[PDB]
Amino acid sequence: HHHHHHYQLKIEGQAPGTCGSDKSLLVSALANGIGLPYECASGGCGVCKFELLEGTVQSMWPDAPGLSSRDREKGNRHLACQCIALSDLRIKVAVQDKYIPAIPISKMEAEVVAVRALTHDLLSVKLRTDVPANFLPGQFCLIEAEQLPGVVRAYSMANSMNPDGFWEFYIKRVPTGRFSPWLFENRKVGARLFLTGPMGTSFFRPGTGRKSLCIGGGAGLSYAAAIARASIRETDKPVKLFYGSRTPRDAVRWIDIDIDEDKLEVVQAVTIGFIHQVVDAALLETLPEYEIYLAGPPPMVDATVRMLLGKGVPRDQIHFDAFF
C-alpha cells in the first residue's frame, strides 16, 4: 500500500499542474498555488465542487454529503477534496485568489511529542516536524495515519506559529465519530503521523478595530483558543469566548495553552437548548459590533451562523470552520 502515480492536472484557464493517486485534487491544486475553492476539506460543505471534463478519478468518500443526491447520480460533478486522479485530468472550476495558500502547503512527517488532558472530553496532542511550524491562527491540518491510508481528517491547530516545529491539536477522549487517524496506538508519545497544511482561509483578521467573540463547540475549542490568543496578542482587549463541554465546570488550564486568563471572559455551555442560545442570551443586540469566529460540529456551526445573520451581523465579520 505504498506506490503512487503522478498525472497532469489541467484546470481550464490555468497553467497545467500535476496531480496524483496519493493526495486529493484540492491539495495538488493548492500545492501548485491555485486558488481552488474549499472550506471543510473533508467532503461536507460542497464548496470545492468541480466538473470532470476528461480523465478518471476515484472518490475517498462516495457518500460524501457535500455532493447532492442528484450530483452523485448524474453528470460529471465531483468534489476536489475527496477525489484522486487515476489519469491525466482536465477539469473546470471557478478559481479565486482568496484561496491561494497564504503559506505554501506541504506534506510533513510529524512525531507525537506530548499528550495531555485538556478537559474531561478533549485530549491535546503536540507533534514535532523537522520543519518550522508555520501557520496563521485559525488554520488547520489534514492528518493521516499510515495504518489507514485513505483516512484524511481535518484538525485546527491549538497553539501558534513557532520555529521549534510544534503542532498542537485537540482530539476526542472517546473515539466516537467513525474513522479517525487517532487510533489509540497513535495517541502515544513517539507515534508518527502525516500533516498536510497549513490549510484554511478562516484565520484571524487583524486591524478590524472590533472586539473578538470566539465560539467553540467540542474539539472546535482549538480554533477558538488560537483566535483568542491572537486577538489578545494584537490588542490586549478582552476576548469573549464561549465553549461547549458535556461535563459541568471542566476548566482548561489557560496558562498551559499560553493564554492570559485576564483579558479572557469564558462562558461554558454544558452539553435545554444549546450554545448559540447561551451566546444570544448573553450578548443580545450587541453582536453586530463583534468580529466573530466559530468552530465545532457542522450542525452547531450552521445553527449559530443562522442566529448571527438573523441578528444583523454582517456576513464578513463571521468566520468559521466545520469539518466532517
Q: Judged by CB under 6 A, does residue 38 bind ligand FES?
A: yes
Q: Judged by CB under 6 A, does residue 41 bind ligand FES?
A: yes
Query: Which region, judged by CB under 6 A, interacts with ligand FES, from 76-84, 94-102, 197-205, 225-233?
Result: 76-84
The entry of Cl ion, ligand FES, none that residue 41 binds, CB within 5 to 8 Å by partner kind: ligand FES
Q: Judged by CB under 6 A, does residue 47 bind ligand FES?
A: yes
Judged by CB under 6 A, the residue of 39, 121, 291, 321 near ligand FES is: 39
Smaller CB separation from ligand FES, 78 or 240: 78
Task: Please work out the total of residues on this chain that contact ligand FES, with binding judged by CB under 6 A.
Answer: 14
Q: Which residues of 115-132 are buried (b: 16+ CB within 10 A; e: fewer)?
A: beebbebbbbbbbbbeee
Smaller CB separation from ligand FES, 67 or 230: 67
Question: Taking the alpha carbons of 195, 200, 76, 13 in that order, is the dihedral positive or negative?
Answer: negative
Smaller CB separation from Cl ion, 10 or 78: 78
Question: Taking the alpha carbons of 200, 196, 87, 15 in that order, is the dihedral positive or negative?
Answer: positive
The entry of Cl ion, ligand FES, none that residue 217 binds, CB within 5 to 8 Å by partner kind: Cl ion
Element (H, E) at 307: helix 298-310
Judged by CB under 6 A, the residue of 35, 66, 101, 198 near ligand FES is: 66
Smaller CB separation from ligand FES, 288 or 298: 298
Judged by CB under 6 A, the residue of 9, 10, 27, 46 near ligand FES is: 46
Q: Judged by CB under 5 A, does residue 107 bind Cl ion?
A: yes
Check whether 40 is labelled as a binding-site residue.
Answer: yes
Burial of residue 135 (CB within 10 Å: 0-12, 13-18, 19+) is buried
Question: Taking the alpha carbons of 215, 219, 223, 228 in that order, is the dihedral positive or negative?
Answer: positive
Question: Taking the alpha carbons of 151, 112, 45, 121 in that order, is the dihedral positive or negative?
Answer: positive
Q: Give the span between the Cα atoms of 46 and 82, in whole angstroms.
A: 10
Helix (H/G/I), strand (E/B), else coil: 286: helix
Q: Give the span between the Cα atoms of 8 and 298, in whole angstroms.
A: 34
Q: Give the span between the Cα atoms of 91 and 100, in whole angstroms.
A: 18
Q: Judged by CB under 6 A, does residue 30 bind ligand FES?
A: no
Element (H, E) at 233: helix 221-235
List beta partners, residue 172.
122
The entry of ligand FES, Cl ion, none that residue 44 binds, CB within 5 to 8 Å by partner kind: ligand FES
The entry of ligand FES, Cl ion, none that residue 45 binds, CB within 5 to 8 Å by partner kind: ligand FES
Helix (H/G/I), strand (E/B), else coil: 254: coil
Q: Judged by CB under 5 A, does residue 49 bind Cl ion?
A: no
3-state secondary structure 119-186: CCCEEEEEEEECCCECCCCCCEEEEEECCEEEEEEEEECCCCCECCCEEEEEEECCCCCCCCCCCHHH
Smallest distance, Å, CB 46 to ligand FES?
A: 5
Question: Mask 124-163, x = binds Cl ion (CB under 5 A)?
Answer: ----------------------------x-------x---
Smaller CB separation from Cl ion, 106 or 288: 106
The contact set with Cl ion (CB under 5 A) reads 23-24, 27, 31, 59, 78-79, 82, 107, 152, 160, 171-172, 180, 182, 217-219, 229-230, 233, 244, 296-297, 300
The contact set with ligand FES (CB under 6 A) reads 38-41, 43-48, 66, 79-81
